[PDB]
Swiss-Prot record, chains A, B:
Regulation of protein activity: Inhibited by 1-(1-acetylpiperidin-4-yl)-3-(4-(trifl uoromethoxy)phenyl)urea (TPAU), 1-cyclohexyl-3-dodecylurea (CDU), 12-(3-adamantan-1-yl-ureido)-dodecanoic acid (AUDA), 1-((3S, 5S, 7S)-adamantan-1-yl)-3-(5-(2-(2-ethoxyethoxy) ethoxy)pentyl)urea (AEPU), N-adamantyl-N[']-cyclohexyl urea (ACU), 4-(((1S, 4S)-4-(3-((3S, 5S, 7S)-adamantan-1-yl) ureido)cyclohexyl)oxy)benzoic acid (c-AUCB), 4-(((1R, 4R)-4-(3-((3S, 5S, 7S)-adamantan-1-yl)ureido)cyclohexyl)oxy)benzoic acid (t-AUCB), 4-(((1R, 4R)-4-(3-(4(trifluoromethoxy)phenyl)ureido)cyclohexyl)oxy)benzoic acid (t-TAUCB) and to a lesser extent by 8-(3-((3S, 5S, 7S)-adamantan-1-yl)ureido) octanoic acid (AUOA).
NCBIfam families, A to Z: HAD-1A3-hyp, HAD-SF-IA-v3
UniProt modified residues of type N6-succinyllysine: 54, 420, 454
Protein name (record): Bifunctional epoxide hydrolase 2
Organism listed in the record: Homo sapiens
Length: 546, 546
């Protein structure tokens, strides 16, 4: 019958607890046992600490009142505090040391996923120290995972006053027997028990999680590692920039710090980076995930030459100019990866660092048209099928649900004949009309892509393939150059089109190239192996793009 | 008959020139005269430097070819280069030293304002050095002021080849006798002269500006300092965030670096910060200029309680959460300034620094309702007029052009009876039906505000005045606190409503408060004295908010 779980911050969701530092400070300074804890609670409901927790005063106003409390306590104990005693120094180190208790947060996320309402109820203060940003960052990371955050200093009440428990129940819209309450301080559990709530005293994490498992009937300990956190489209900041008359680019933006621009492939969306966007922002970066030209909310003009590399790269430079960005890190996948190599070759001043997932850097052959290279290979027969305007559009737009369900599949779930596409007369000729759902995607995720492609269709996206000769002529101007800015190439073991061996001569052009490799990964890298992608990108950004 | 002016970058728009460093390096190192200049030009059209300027190779590829050229030149001169000789060190220092030639840029801006087409035509390279950002920033600042930027390394041609001059004329759509060409290198003028263009050899800035004045008939030297650069609404990045169902906030965004949030007053728009937005972004900040709730493209719900301070401050915190910002600097004016003091009092962790233009911090009096304080003063009689829903709306919405033309005026151009507004029966009862245009604003600027207020009217904006009792009750909770984060108060000498003497007791609440004062400034601070505002804010941000 439980349907809500309430957690404390200090000592429960974040470790170590502040009170723990008071005891460790006493032992380190050879002070009488409990002395700093007595000064902290000095006065009870009338004391300085209660005024602080109720929001009457700020942390900087409380520090000298706590220092005065430490002297009154030392005088009655007949001891002398060291000459270098500082409450600010002690509290600063305690707050900095506090980190998220990962297994406790994972249990909260699992309960929320199974239908529970989750909340944080904490005794906290108005932090106005010069170092207050460290605390703001902690709260931001936690608050996105809970339904409610109730802070004592904002509501004017504190634990253990019985009215804060009534306020909590009114907010949750639940009766006490439907609520689990976790706290590390016994006195704070007593009022919740008097009301009828299930209480768990937190001394060590594992024992508290075992009690929680037993009482909710859900497995929380020994569970598989969850997928990274993903975006909700309606919670994102949406940005719109006009780069040319009748050409507007849409993007999604999150975080602060060095700008990182994400460039998707075919036939994708900004939504293909849903697992990377929160991870990269949390790592200290300002992420801009684009809808490339021809896709989603970006403009989709019908003319073929609007999609040649020269025009696309120039519009990306105009995008940085209108946003007031002198530089950005460029990360691309598939057609987006092809574009980011050309950005580094033609506009290195604007590119802080360049990374490509799956797409190798392949230099143009001045002795052979790209049409002849494509005809002398059976794996690229689909590129000839994509040439005639109207042909692939009619097949791909006929049933959008079938199109995305057939393309977005893991390497072992393939349902498409990759060869003799032209001979067969289409991409889906030997394919089922109702394909099964892949393990990589949910029905809700597929429907987001369906909704986006209902707006402009496949004309714009397919035109990226209809400029082979124009792109070849433009690329021939860079054959004498080398890429000498920080670069990363990530290969995917099981990509059918972009095999890892197609990247082996890149070191001749990018002599200081860094590499990444993902085993058991197909073409749709970001959604196939999201944890592995995040780890490779974050490590490279922190060392080579900082 | 002149209608286009073309400028070189090196030696003309940016000083000192690169060639100037080669000569100064020779003198400093006691090398033979002209040695480094001979190595630089070694090979002519077939030499390394021409390949660099045409985009065949990058700057890092050219450095060791230039080092080899310096050795071949030294061998034939029978001299030895010092043991610590480095082309990279020499070029790095030269590029860093180069700064915008302010009077040359001012002359370019004046000509553009008088109808001329302006362009930069330069011999430049693909910069891939680790320090390339310094150059990208320089180009970004310059490119926003010119119609065209033609770089040799992007077009594959160089000065003095005659085809680059033909390419320039085709781009400008003009005949040679309609073009003025400025360059510091004589050889680069010769082809432009052969075509019939007016040429100016730049040796010193003043003499070149005198020749330019004489030939265009426009005064360029000894002119009054121009106003700061202003935004074009259609060139801005527009951002939209949903903070609550049916409540979406619109903002304009520019720059990179620490986030700065601008909060306008009544009855204004994000457009009221048009002179501060480019200046703050250029100073190294990421500016977010809001349309506050009830205004422009932000949501404007009709309910009065949607505009009380508690709700407004909470939505501003949700805005930072959805954008992934742990902190922002908050700068407000008028009603926006009132809001930023309450953000610092209730959410100090989220506020890096706080600044208010005109609006002082006035603490609530727990012994008297704000309605009684307003009735015991004749200058605030307009606040009683704004109380009754529908009354001030009908008068202010009747003729939008008259409304904005009557309000947006300098201190000496006032046309409104400020007292006995209720007795008189309105704000505009003794006002002309067609008021003259103020010197602060253009007709085009007034029409932007007219267009914005056509969407939602005055209901939302007026509701900010209809929560006096609710705001008073909420503010009473902070009477024991002090503002101890970095703070700035800016007073305006001639503001009729917010007189500087209303701010005199702020030091009791904000003991380390910094101050600014603007003489001969009325209520509309940002557009009345924009240069003075920019200088006060930039100085304070760089010292107290960095
Ligand atoms: O065509 C691609 N990739 C690519 C992306 C998505 C799909 C295919 C190929 C493909 C091929 C055959 C059948 C179905 C499909 S699919 O619709 O699943 N590229 C060429 C240009 C590049 F090198 F820039 C990057 C890779
Ligand atoms: O009402 C204001 N300012 C303000 C802003 C704009 C105009 C007036 C007052 C006003 C007053 C009388 C006639 C015309 C006009 S007006 O439409 O030109 N404030 C009160 C709350 C505050 F203290 F937060 C900031 C200042």
């Amino acid at each position: 019958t439980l349907r809500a779980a309430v957690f404390d911050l200090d000592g429960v969701l974040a470790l170590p607890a502040v009170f723990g530092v008071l005891g460790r400070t006493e032992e380190a300074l050879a002070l009488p046992r409990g002395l700093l804890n007595d000064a902290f609670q000095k006065g009870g409901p009338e004391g300085a600490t209660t005024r602080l927790m109720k929001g009457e005063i700020t942390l900087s106003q409380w520090i000298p009142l706590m220092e005065e409390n430490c002297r009154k306590c030392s005088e009655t104990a007949k001891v002398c505090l060291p000459k270098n005693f500082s409450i600010k120094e002690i509290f600063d180190k305690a707050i900095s040391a506090r980190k998220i208790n990962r297994p406790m947060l994972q249990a909260a996320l699992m309960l929320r996923k199974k239908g529970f309402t989750t909340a944080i109820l904490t005794n906290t203060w108005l932090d106005d120290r010069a170092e207050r940003d460290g605390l703001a960052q902690l709260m931001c990371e936690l608050k996105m995972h809970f339904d409610f955050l109730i802070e004592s200093c904002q509501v004017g009440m504190v634990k253990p006053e019985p009215q804060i428990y009534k306020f909590l129940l009114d907010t949750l819209k639940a009766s006490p027997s439907e609520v689990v309450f976790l706290d590390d301080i016994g006195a704070n559990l007593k009022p919740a028990r008097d009301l009828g709530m299930v209480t768990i005293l937190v001394q060590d994490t594992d024992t508290a999680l075992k009690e929680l498992e037993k009482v909710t009937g859900i497995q929380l300990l020994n569970t598989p590692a969850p997928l990274p956190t993903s975006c909700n489209p309606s919670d994102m900041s949406h940005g719109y920039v006009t780069v040319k008359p009748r050409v507007r680019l849409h993007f999604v933006e999150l975080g602060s710090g060095p700008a990182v621009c994400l460039c998707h492939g075919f036939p994708e969306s900004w939504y293909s980076w849903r697992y990377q966007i929160p991870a990269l922002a949390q790592a200290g970066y300002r992420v801009l995930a684009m809808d490339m030209k021809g896709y989603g909310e970006s403009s989709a003009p019908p003319e073929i030459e609007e999609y040649c590399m020269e025009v696309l790269c120039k519009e990306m430079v105009t995008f940085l100019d209108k946003l007031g960005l002198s530089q950005a890190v460029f990360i691309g996948h598939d057609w987006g990866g092809m574009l980011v190599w050309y950005m580094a070759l033609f506009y290195p001043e604007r590119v802080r660092a360049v990374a490509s997932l799956n797409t190798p850097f392949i230099p143009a052959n001045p002795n052979m048209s790209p049409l002849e290279s494509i005809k002398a290979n059976p794996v690229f027969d689909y590129q000839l099928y994509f040439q005639e305007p109207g042909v692939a559009e009619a097949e791909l737009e006929q049933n959008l649900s079938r199109t995305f369900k057939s393309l977005f599949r893991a390497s072992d779930e393939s349902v498409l004949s990759m060869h003799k596409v032209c001979e067969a007369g289409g991409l889906f000729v030997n394919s089922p009309e109702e394909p099964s759902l892949s393990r990589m995607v949910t029905e809700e995720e597929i429907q987001f892509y369906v909704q986006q492609f209902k707006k402009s269709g496949f004309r714009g996206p397919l035109n990226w393939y209809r400029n082979m000769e124009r792109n070849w002529k433009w690329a021939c101007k860079s054959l004498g150059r080398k890429i000498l800015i920080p670069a990363l190439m990530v290969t995917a073991e099981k990509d059918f089109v972009l095999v890892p061996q197609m990247s082996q001569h890149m070191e001749d052009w990018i002599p200081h190239l860094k590499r990444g490799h993902i085993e058991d990964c197909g073409h749709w890298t970001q959604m196939d192996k999201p944890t592995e992608v995040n780890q490779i990108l974050i490590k490279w950004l922190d060392s080579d793009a900082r």
